[PDB]
Amino acid sequence: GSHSMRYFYTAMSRPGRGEPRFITVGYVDDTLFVRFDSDATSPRKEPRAPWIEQEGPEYWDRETQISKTNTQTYRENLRTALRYYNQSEAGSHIIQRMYGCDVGPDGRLLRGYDQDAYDGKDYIALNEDLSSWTAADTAAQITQRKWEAARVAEQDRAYLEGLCVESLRRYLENGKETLQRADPPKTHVTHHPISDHEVTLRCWALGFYPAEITLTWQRDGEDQTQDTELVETRPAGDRTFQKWAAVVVPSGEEQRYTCHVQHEGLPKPLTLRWEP
């Protein structure tokens, strides 16, 4: 149905160890498709998904140039940030950027993004209107003033409404075999006795794509949020993801618990129980 394309930049300064490292990764939904690392032997944009490989040489030269130029821009950004925050040139700092677009089933722009962070904290973000900015502090306000004077939002908007959705549409078609295929989770409940009267019930979800999923345990039909151990969704390494939820229950009461699974690959939410 709905899809997204996102580019992520990480610029990390390292005084005494060369110029700031610049890394870019591009994703369509939860699929990595392109990368760039300024520390690579011969730095250039490289394909990470089968469907992007058909893009011609002009595509790769252009995309590589964008990364090389932006490497310089973010290195400049790091020097500027030092000034804005009255910091010394002796420490290591990080600037991150995330930008891109979301489209609906019909492929029309749902919303665009372009935001930055400095040392892990919000710095500045393009608002949903794609015409104004939200600055996190007085330092970012200086950047906001510069971007308003340069009409950056309008230029970003042109990209987000044009090339962003246009290229995303192409990628979705070229990679429809995978980007447009949801793999439902393979589920099961394990039983692990802890002590004489306490047992661990763990609900597993494996091999699913995309990553979005909801796993919950209910006791007599009531959500057990506070007593559920929920691990972060993790990559399997084969494009799919894994996740589990566990609850410690009194021996003999296993049947009062039900695991509920929601995933777009499932026609309807699943309900599972321990099966002795």
Binding site: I23, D122, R234
Partner: peptide
């Protein structure tokens, strides 16, 4: 390991395998 990426809260994540 995977290429450096990050989440919505700007925190990083990597997979070593």
């Amino acid at each position: 390991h995977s290429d450096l990426s990050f989440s919505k809260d700007w925190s990083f994540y990597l997979l070593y395998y």
